[PDB]
Design a protein around this ligand. Structure first.
Ligand SMILES: *[C@@H]1O[C@H](CO)[C@@H](O)[C@H](O)[C@H]1NC(C)=O
Ligand SMILES: *[C@@H]1O[C@H](CO)[C@@H](O)[C@H](O)[C@H]1NC(C)=O
Ligand SMILES: *[C@@H]1O[C@H](CO)[C@@H](O)[C@H](O)[C@H]1NC(C)=O
Lengths: 142, 883, 92
């Protein structure tokens, strides 16, 4: 039943074992294991897991040329980047651009630019609030 | 090129007495410097008619006398400091008349920097006072920097030392105090101490110490006075007791071993709060780190015991060999430190004869350096004496090779000779050349003579064999064809395609002694003297098998035909007690290292682990884990890591159960140190790999500790394992964090700082990384250790990588140890992904670690291929053994 | 009572420091403190650190301090820190 197959395909991302996550990524490429129809959203679900943030970022940024021939890059790149909150991650994004825009990015071609914008906003927002928000939580959580 | 353009003294001057006075001003001066006054006169004999004085002097402000830095016997022309060579050069107007003794005398001042070079000072907190201690480090190059001298190992002379210190403090040197300490008539706030004349010794062995330490004392049956000095607060806790307990038996052991009673009257040992190295042998004032001399039965592990007794045995061994008969020039350094590195294991054997410590030489030195020498980039032992001249060229000799290969080859020497013949030879050498300087060839003369008097049979002279080993790099892998007993040797290069740059004058042909056993019975010794030989002693039939290199006394690897490997495996699984304990480690580690060289299938190396399911001994478990670390580190992110874990559980599960019985549910440790190590390896492996028993029992211990904050239930031997595994399962982490902030004892603070990295929660680890930047949360010297600990945690790998990618120009431009940091962070790299990321990081931008970055690239390429070459087969093997 | 020598220049062990030993209401100007009353009890008070320790030896006496409290009967006894039979105290 497709519904339960998808619930499981999601829930497998919630594991804390990194090696499970990466073997799951390997299966995520194997079309016979999980179909091309839904590999992308499985990777997005790995990214939702905070441990999978690293895996998915280094995966995509180190092999995106493979995915570019066949995988939807727009929402995938959105999902992978949206945790970015530091000027270093901005540097990483812009270098991934300079490293790969020589082939463009298909449907992601605009989305990456959007991410480049929003990450910058997030950077300043963190600078605006990290102390105050922490203070509040440190008080009211007693 | 003039003499002061050269980096060696002329042999025209021989000193023959010294006098020294030192006044360390431990209070800072107005400009915040710490300065000492020094006076010295040296007497020297002209060995060759000359008219200029050349003497070492560095970083000294002199006092001018007669318009010049020194007073002489014809007149002096002029005096200069040739800083690039550190010579005080003093032209005479006339010529110094040969065969005459003259004083050269000087007074000077210097700085007590905390540089750990020369007469440096150390500062430490005691109570709430920053106490200050003046000490000496004089390893090779720095002795001149405390006072002017002919600073060469060959230029041995006699010292009278005098010290002048604040009245409250105590002073020490190589000899006993010649009479009690007297107030200085210039100022009774100062005391004065004089010492008896040292024997003929080299300058690099002096020590001067002024301190407020307090001591614990024993009178040896041999009549020598032996005496541990430490911080008074530390000594009152009895932390010196163990050192004083062991040091007697060891000394009488060496007194037997060299057939030579201890030459000095006393044997001070002193534990300094901080030190660069672990120890230094300064004759009769042996110096150690706190953590390597003091011992607390309430907190240190048995590993601390074996470190303490081992280090002690080493530095005491230097008190004869090395200090009594000294090296001629630094090119022979390997003869000393490696030889002592051997004898220390025999020395501790006498002090704690129930620990079989002699076996661990195999793990800690032979195999620690076989992996280093197995590279074309290695170097032989005996470099030409002309190659070593500058202080950099001297300092570079203190490396893994010079210690551990020296130990290995000298062990082999003591094994193909009868050990009693080695004793006789060594004793005759020390008796003949005492207080002189020698080259190794004099030692091999004495051994040749003792061998002849015993008429030990050898294929050639000892000089021949030991020059076959001494002056060419690498070592053979012996290859046996048991079908015929044909035998061959070849140079084992770990990369089988690496280009050999350095030539061999023997074309890498060795002479090899080969002990061997057959079906559990020892066979007679055989010698190999060629690239090939045949001997029926190695032919086999039916179920017969052979094993070579008994007790791995020989420094070479061994290979057998496939069928013989099957025979050995069959025997070992049938009854492994038939094969000596060491050789069961040897036969693993050989299989793995040969496998890396494509000289054997990796399936064979994995096969050799199979018997461990019923092994109990420490050695083979250790060797197995040490090899399989490579597999874990390579595959721990791959799918292959899945089956592998289950395999280790199967292997280690029975062993854990055994100790659970044999420790009455962990209520007492085993009485034998080797069994304690095996316990730790069992609990560590089985727990970290995930036996269900640990997630209960270790957690229980940890929560019981949380119930008893001042009353820790966990035995110190287990602490480091249980801490980390409990942390692997917030309130525990925060508990350990507040413990760490409250932690008084450095051993515990380190153990916690490691264990806190075992947490699973990425937000915990990221907090930890953020705290790594706060100098108050962690002492800025140790931040790197934290980064490394977080990196080796599989969850932290990508985190630390992106962190350094963020911070590199920061912590580069202002922090430190980038080299081993980059080593830690890159070594997981195994595919072109991170190869590209790493080359980008290079292009985007390394201090000392720059070459380490190149190293990271190189092995990464090999890793890239290695995984491609092996994954599926290894996978298929483990899934097969997964059951 | 005794102490180790201490203070950064001394043996922790070579010989005790600050010895003080007393016999209750013995007065040297009044000689041996005799047991007059029909009964008596012998009691020891350590005052001393670390692995230092002390004890009373039998000396030459056929009995020991303390042990005499196990109902040994005598015609007379007297005690004195000055010389009867001796019993030296030893520190270790
Ligand atoms: C140090 O000086 C004192 C007087 O201040 C003197 O009596 C003593 O003998 C000297 N030696 C030591 C170890 O204190
Ligand atoms: C020294 O070691 C021995 C071990 O044989 C032990 O009996 C003794 O109690 C230890 N301590 C001292 C002070 O001898
Ligand atoms: C081999 O080493 C063991 C120690 O593990 C020792 O008992 C045995 O005598 C040694 N035998 C030979 C032949 O070296």
């Amino acid at each position: 039943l497709v519904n339960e197959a998808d619930k499981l395909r999601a829930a497998l991302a919630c594991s804390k074992e990194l090696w499970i996550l990466n073997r799951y990524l390997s299966y995520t490429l194997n079309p016979d294991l999980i179909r091309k129809q839904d590999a992308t959203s499985t990777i997005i679900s790995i990214t939702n897991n905070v441990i999978g943030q690293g895996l998915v970022w280094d995966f995509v940024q180190s092999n995106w040329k493979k995915l570019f021939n066949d995988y939807s890059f727009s929402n995938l790149i959105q999902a992978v980047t949206r945790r970015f909150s530091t000027e270093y991650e901005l540097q990483q994004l812009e270098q991934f651009k300079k490293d790969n825009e020589e082939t463009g990015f298909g449907s992601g071609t605009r989305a990456l630019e959007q991410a480049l914008e929003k990450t910058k906003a997030n950077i300043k927002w963190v600078k605006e609030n990290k102390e105050v928000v922490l203070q509040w939580f440190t008080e009211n959580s007693k | 090129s003039k003499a002061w353009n050269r980096y060696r003294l002329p042999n025209t001057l021989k000193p023959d007495s010294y006098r020294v006075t030192l006044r360390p001003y431990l209070t800072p001066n107005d400009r915040g410097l710490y300065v000492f006054k020094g006076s010295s006169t040296v007497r020297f004999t002209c060995k060759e008619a000359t008219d200029v004085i050349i003497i070492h002097s560095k970083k000294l402000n002199y006092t001018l006398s007669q318009g010049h830095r020194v007073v002489l016997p014809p007149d002096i022309d002029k005096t200069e400091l040739v800083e690039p060579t550190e010579y005080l050069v003093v032209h005479l107007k006339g010529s110094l008349v040969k065969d005459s003794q003259y004083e050269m005398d000087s007074e000077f001042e210097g700085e007590l920097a905390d540089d750990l070079a020369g007469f440096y000072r150390s500062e430490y907190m005691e109570g709430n006072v920053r106490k200050v201690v003046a000490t000496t480090q004089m390893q090779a190059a720095d002795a001149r920097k405390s006072f002017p001298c002919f600073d060469e190992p060959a230029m041995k002379a006699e010292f009278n030392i005098t010290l002048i210190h604040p009245k409250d403090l105590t002073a020490l040197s190589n000899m006993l105090p010649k009479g009690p300490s007297t107030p200085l008539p210039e100022d009774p706030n100062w005391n004065v101490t004089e010492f008896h004349t040292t024997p003929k010794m080299s300058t690099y062995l002096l020590a001067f110490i002024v301190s407020e330490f307090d001591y614990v004392e024993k009178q040896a049956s041999n009549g020598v006075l032996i005496r541990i000095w430490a911080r008074p607060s530390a000594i009152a806790a009895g932390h010196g007791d163990y050192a004083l307990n062991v040091t007697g038996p060891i000394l009488n052991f060496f007194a037997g071993h060299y057939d030579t009673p201890y030459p000095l009257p006393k044997s001070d040992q002193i534990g300094l709060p901080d030190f660069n190295a672990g120890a230094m042998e300064n004759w009769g004032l042996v110096t150690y780190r706190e953590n390597s001399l003091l011992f607390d039965p309430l907190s240190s592990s048995s590993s601390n015991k074996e470190r303490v007794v081992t280090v002690i045995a080493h530095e005491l061994a230097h008190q004869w060999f090395g200090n009594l008969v000294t090296i001629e020039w630094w090119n022979d350094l390997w003869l000393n430190e490696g030889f002592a590195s051997y004898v220390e294991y025999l020395g501790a054997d006498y002090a704690e004869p129930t620990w079989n410590l002699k076996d661990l030489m195999v793990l800690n030195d032979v195999y620690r350096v076989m992996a280093v020498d197995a590279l074309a980039s290695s170097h032989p032992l005996s470099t030409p004496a002309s190659e070593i001249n500058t202080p950099a060229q001297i300092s570079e000799l203190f490396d893994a090779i010079s210690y551990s290969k020296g130990a290995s080859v000298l062990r082999m020497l003591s094994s193909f000779l009868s050990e009693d013949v080695f004793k006789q030879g060594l004793a005759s050498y020390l008796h003949t050349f005492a207080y002189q300087n020698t080259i190794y060839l004099n030692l091999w003369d004495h051994l040749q003579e003792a061998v002849n008097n015993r008429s030990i049979q050898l294929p050639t002279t000892v000089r021949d064999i030991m020059n076959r080993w001494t002056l060419q790099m690498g070592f053979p892998v012996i290859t046996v064809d048991t079908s015929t007993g044909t035998l061959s040797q070849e140079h084992f290069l770990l990369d089988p395609d690496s280009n050999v740059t350095r030539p061999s004058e023997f074309n890498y042909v060795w002479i090899v002694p080969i002990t061997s056993i057959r079906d559990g019975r020892q066979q007679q010794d055989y010698w190999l003297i060629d690239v090939r030989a045949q001997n029926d002693l190695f032919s086999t039939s039916g179920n017969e098998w052979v094993l070579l290199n008994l007790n791995v006394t020989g420094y070479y690897r061994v290979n057998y035909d496939e069928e013989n490997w099957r025979k050995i495996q069959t025997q070992l699984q049938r009854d492994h007690s038939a094969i000596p304990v060491i050789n069961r480690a040897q036969i693993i580690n050989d299989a793995f290292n040969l496998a890396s060289a494509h000289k054997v299938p990796v399936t064979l190396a994995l096969n050799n682990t199979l018997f461990l399911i019923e092994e109990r001994q420490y050695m083979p478990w250790e060797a197995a884990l040490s090899s399989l670390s490579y597999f874990k580190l390579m595959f721990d992110r791959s799918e292959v890591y899945g089956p592998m874990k289950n395999y280790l559980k199967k292997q280690v599960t029975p062993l854990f159960i055994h100790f659970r019985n044999n420790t009455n549910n962990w209520r007492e440790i085993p009485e034998n140190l080797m069994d304690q190590y095996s316990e730790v390896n069992a609990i560590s492996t089985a727990c970290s790999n995930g036996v269900p028993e640990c997630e209960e029992m270790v957690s229980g211990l940890f929560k019981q500790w949380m119930e008893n904050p001042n009353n820790n239930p966990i035995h110190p031997n287990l602490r480091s394992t249980v801490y980390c595994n409990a942390i692997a399962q917030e309130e525990e982490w925060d508990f350990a964090w507040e413990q760490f902030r409250n932690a008084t004892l450095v051993n515990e603070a380190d153990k916690l700082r490691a264990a806190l990295a075992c947490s699973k929660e990425l937000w915990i680890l990221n907090r930890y990384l953020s705290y790594t930047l706060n100098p108050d949360l962690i002492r800025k010297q140790d931040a790197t250790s934290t980064i490394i600990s977080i990196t080796n945690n599989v969850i932290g790998q990508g985190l630390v990588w992106d962190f350094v990618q963020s911070n590199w120009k920061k912590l580069f431009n202002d922090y430190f140890s980038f080299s081993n940091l980059i080593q830690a962070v890159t070594r997981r790299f195994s595919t072109e992904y991170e190869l590209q990321q790493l080359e980008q990081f290079k292009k985007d931008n390394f201090g000392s670690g720059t070459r380490a970055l190149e190293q990271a690239l190189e092995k990464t390429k090999a890793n890239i291929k290695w995984v491609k070459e092996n994954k599926e087969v290894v996978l298929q093997w483990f899934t097969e053994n997964s059951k | 009572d005794f102490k180790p020598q201490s203070g950064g220049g001394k043996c922790f062990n070579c010989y005790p420091a600050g010895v003080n030993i007393t016999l209750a209401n013995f007065n040297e100007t009044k000689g041996p403190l005799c047991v007059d009353t029909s009964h008596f009890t012998t009691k020891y008070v350590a005052v001393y650190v670390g692995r230092w320790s002390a004890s009373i030896n039998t000396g030459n006496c056929p009995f020991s301090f303390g042990k005499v409290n196990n109902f040994v009967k005598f015609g007379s006894v007297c005690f004195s820190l000055k010389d009867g039979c001796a019993m030296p105290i030893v520190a270790n």
